[PDB]
Write a protein that binds this DNA or RNA. Structure first.
Lengths: 150, 129, 80, 123, 205
RNA sequence: CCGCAGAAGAAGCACCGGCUAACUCCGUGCCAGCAGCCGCGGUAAUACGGAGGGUGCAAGCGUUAAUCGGAAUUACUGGGCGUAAAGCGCACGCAGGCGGUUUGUUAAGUCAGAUGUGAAAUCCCCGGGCUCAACCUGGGAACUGCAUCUGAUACUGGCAA
RNA sequence: GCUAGUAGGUGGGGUAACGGCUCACCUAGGCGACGAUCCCUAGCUGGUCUGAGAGGAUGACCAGCCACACUGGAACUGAGA
RNA sequence: UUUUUUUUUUUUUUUUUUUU
């Protein structure tokens, strides 16, 4: 019962010698509703073939996000070249008021109380890369309680 | 480091603790040894020792978990003359509730939580998280 | 209940007066450095024992002439 | 891609370049009809359009467009002034909502409704 | 000023099994969903990420029959209130005077019930509050007045609601026609099929 | 409020691109023309200009004179120095900024309190009187500072070493 | 680049009460790049068109100031002009 | 780090709608 979505695309088609060339790309996210989120890229000679190749890569493992219960307990750094980025939990009761530019990557797991819109860049790639590569850097309750105990 | 007493105490626990060491050692100072104490007793470090008693050195067992610095999210916010004195209910309450900060006031160096409960404001040394 | 400032003797002209002027301890809402601007501490001296070179304590008395309120009390910082 | 050439006109189709000099207070004003003209040979063969000058104290001389239908917009009048310098007009930097006084403007144009202020026809 | 009709035109876009006309013959067989309700574009329409919340403001605006006026003046205080968007807003439209009387069965349609309440046929504990945005809070009471209490339309409701799901949030008498909300409506069992938070997120776009 | 007498007596403008929002049948040839960022018209003009229908909404509907929106910008509270803009070839000293860090001591700033100010309509919450929305309101609070004093000592500055 | 009774003593005089507030006088003392001269441009407050809000901004409800009402300067008469 | 075998060649107008 995994959930499977696009986010972004290119027009990617230029002049040459010689006439014009074109391509078909995709940036997609997948997840599993108990807490697991992931992401994958692709390309083809054709539209859905690129989406296919992209989602097939997105189906890889999916990071179990530290949720307790409907949303998550630390601002884990999504570190990139300035995105910064962080998200902010809301008090488990009001919705996913996140940036529609990157909301996908948390609605594929049904994370119901997290907000923050597109902080330092007007580009959905900038934040969607920044997040998954910094979500792997999360800590469990039992890990923050070893870090401040044993 | 003398341009900002006692600031190097928060940089050195970031440096060594990123840099592969379970250990760091330095000369002691009028606020640092109380900070070392609270960092253990909350558990952000594994131990501290103090050594050469009549003119002592100050030594902390950094917590080299996954090879990454425990004090990576840290900020030392009060600076020279442009101090940060805050009232008993203006105090830090960070990370949506999970905390914390380390302060100093009319009973010593302590956590912001333990300050809020004693009902006192103070000198905001650092946001530990 | 005296207001006791810590005055450098910074001018002498009058047979029974001295100017002990230091910074103006009444503050205002601003950045975060000390209140380092003067106030005119004019003082009816008579013993003249503090001369040029002490720092003197003082207290609030009548302006027996042109707003010259204070009198001398004791030497806060001796002779240099 | 050489920006000094490129910036002038490149792909927009409203093309923002509008030249609207002078200020000295506000744009929404009263404007005396001063002295009528209908002179000046141009490419748009402008017909019956008496485009006059206004005695605005602004640091140079200026002119206004006739702003709406109705042929009498005499030299003794004093109408309202507003921006909207169509590509057609050289020199001018305003048009006019001109049915004040005795100059009337819209005559029996039932379609004009909220755009000029006219009443209903025969329902 | 609340739109008046063509009332089944509202169903031909707001969708299936609405309260507005609950009762007889029209339901399914002439509200044309699955047939082709908008025939010309029927071949390949689309939606929008915002548009799909917009049709759900429309759900709430037309199923209960309230103005753009009221949608703003219920949200006005919903920034002071303490719960979810579904409590803060959608519950109130379910329990304003012209809506609660339909719910108990003092009228047969959710467009008839408003006309009734402005006609001085209903009271609140004595108050003939035709100001039908007035909202009837729990354990205090709403009644049809004496000279209108079993008056034809009422029995065309009460004999027809008898075969259907009557909610527990409110309680009535079906033989002397008076009642109240016995608790606050709950976003679980409020039985409106709506995603009750869309109508305030629609401000954030 | 209570009987007669009748749905009777009570509505419309933008318009319709795309922005929140519904589209076509036609016109005149960068005509006449809106002109806010965009976009429209260069004989096939989706909103220029006419018309058919319908739409957003209903004592309302577009739009206007200013200016911040979204947009993060004069930043003790809030900052960017490869970029827009961005450590100025160069530092003789005159004032100025930071003056090495701790003992014994000190509390003026630090912080908490007791007591005063802010009669009454706040902001922020409830309970109600009118049929009632409103309105009319009463009740509950919070006000950094400044005053007068009781303290608690980790900084800010000092004092003796 | 600003002082003139202005800066300090002398001591005469009168303010309910202070003082170059000031005369006369003996002497030249007072300020300044830790903003002295001098002008901008303005109604200012509790509030609030708008709130994590800090900024942009208005001063006009009630009054609080003023300040009038022809250009008014100003004395008198009145507790109160 | 020697790199002058002649200097010049008018404006257009291409450009298969659109949300994804």
């Amino acid at each position: 019962e995994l959930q499977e979505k696009l986010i972004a695309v290119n027009r990617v088609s230029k002049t040459v010698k010689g006439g014009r060339i074109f391509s078909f790309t995709a940036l997609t996210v997948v997840g599993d509703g108990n807490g697991r989120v992931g992401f994958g890229y692709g390309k083809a000679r054709e539209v859905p073939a690129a989406i296919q190749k992209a989602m097939e890569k997105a189906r890889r493992n999916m990071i179990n996000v530290a949720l307790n219960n409907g949303t998550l307990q630390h601002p884990v750094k999504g570190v990139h070249t300035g995105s910064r980025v962080f998200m902010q939990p809301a008090s488990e009761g009001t919705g996913i008021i996140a940036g529609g530019a990157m909301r996908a990557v948390l609605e594929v797991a049904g994370v119901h109380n997290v907000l923050a819109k597109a902080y330092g860049s007007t580009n959905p790639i900038n934040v969607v890369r920044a997040t998954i590569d910094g979500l792997e850097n999360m800590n469990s309750p039992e890990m923050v309680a070893a870090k401040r105990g044993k | 480091s003398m341009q900002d007493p006692i600031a190097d105490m928060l940089t050195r626990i970031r440096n060594g603790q990123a840099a592969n060491k379970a250990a760091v050692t330095m000369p002691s100072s009028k606020l640092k040894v109380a900070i070392a104490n609270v960092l253990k007793e909350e558990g952000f470090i594994e131990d501290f020792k103090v050594e050469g008693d009549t003119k002592p050195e100050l030594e902390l067992t950094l917590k080299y978990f996954q090879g990454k610095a425990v004090v990576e999210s840290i900020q030392r916010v009060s600076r020279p003359g442009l101090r940060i004195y805050k009232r008993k209910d203006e105090l830090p309450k960070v990370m949506a509730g999970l905390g914390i900060a380390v302060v100093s006031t009319s009973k010593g160096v302590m956590t912001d939580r333990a300050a809020r409960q004693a009902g006192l404001g103070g000198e905001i040394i650092c946001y530990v998280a | 209940k005296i207001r006791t400032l810590q005055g450098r003797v910074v001018s002498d002209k009058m047979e029974k007066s001295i100017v002990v002027a230091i910074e103006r301890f009444v503050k205002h809402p601003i950045y975060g450095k000390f209140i380092k601007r003067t106030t005119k501490l004019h003082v009816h001296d008579e013993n003249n024992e503090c001369g040029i070179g002490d720092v003197v304590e003082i207290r609030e008395c009548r302006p027996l002439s042109k707003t010259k309120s204070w009198t001398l009390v004791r030497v806060v910082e001796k002779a240099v | 891609a050489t920006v000094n050439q490129l910036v002038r006109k490149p792909r927009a189709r409203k093309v923002a370049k509008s030249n609207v000099p002078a200020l000295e207070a506000c744009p929404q004003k009263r404007g005396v009809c001063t002295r009528v003209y209908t002179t000046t040979p141009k490419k748009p063969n402008s017909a019956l359009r008496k485009v006059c000058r206004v005695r605005l104290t602004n640091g140079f001389e200026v002119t206004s467009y006739i702003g709406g239908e109705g042929h009498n917009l005499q030299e003794h009048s004093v109408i309202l002034i507003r921006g909207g310098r169509v590509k057609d007009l050289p020199g001018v930097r305003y048009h006019t909502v001109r049915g004040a006084l005795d100059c009337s403007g819209v005559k029996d144009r039932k379609q004009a409704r909220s755009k000029y202020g006219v009443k209903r026809p025969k329902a | 000023a609340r739109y008046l009709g063509p009332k089944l035109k509202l169903s031909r876009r707001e969708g299936t099994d609405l309260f507005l006309k609950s009762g007889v013959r029209a339901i399914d067989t002439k509200c044309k969903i699955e047939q082709a309700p908008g025939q010309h574009g029927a071949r390949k329409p689309r939606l929008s990420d915002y548009g799909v919340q917009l049709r759900e403001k429309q759900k709430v605006r037309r199923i209960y029959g309230v103005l753009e006026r009221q949608f703003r003046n219920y949200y006005k205080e919903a920034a002071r209130l303490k719960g979810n968007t579904g409590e803060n807003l959608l519950a109130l439209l379910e329990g304003r005077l012209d809506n609660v009387v339909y719910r108990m069965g003092f009228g047969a349609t959710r467009a008839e019930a408003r006309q009734l309440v402005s006609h001085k046929a209903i009271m609140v504990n004595g108050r003939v509050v035709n100001i039908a945005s007035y909202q009837v809070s729990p354990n205090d009471v709403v009644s049809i007045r004496e000279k209108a209490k079993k008056q034809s339309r009422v029995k065309a409701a009460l004999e027809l609601a008898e075969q259907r799901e009557k909610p527990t949030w409110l309680e009535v008498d079906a033989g002397k026609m008076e009642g109240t909300f016995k608790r606050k409506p709950e976003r679980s069992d409020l039985s409106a099929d709506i995603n009750e938070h869309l109508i305030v997120e629609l401000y954030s776009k």
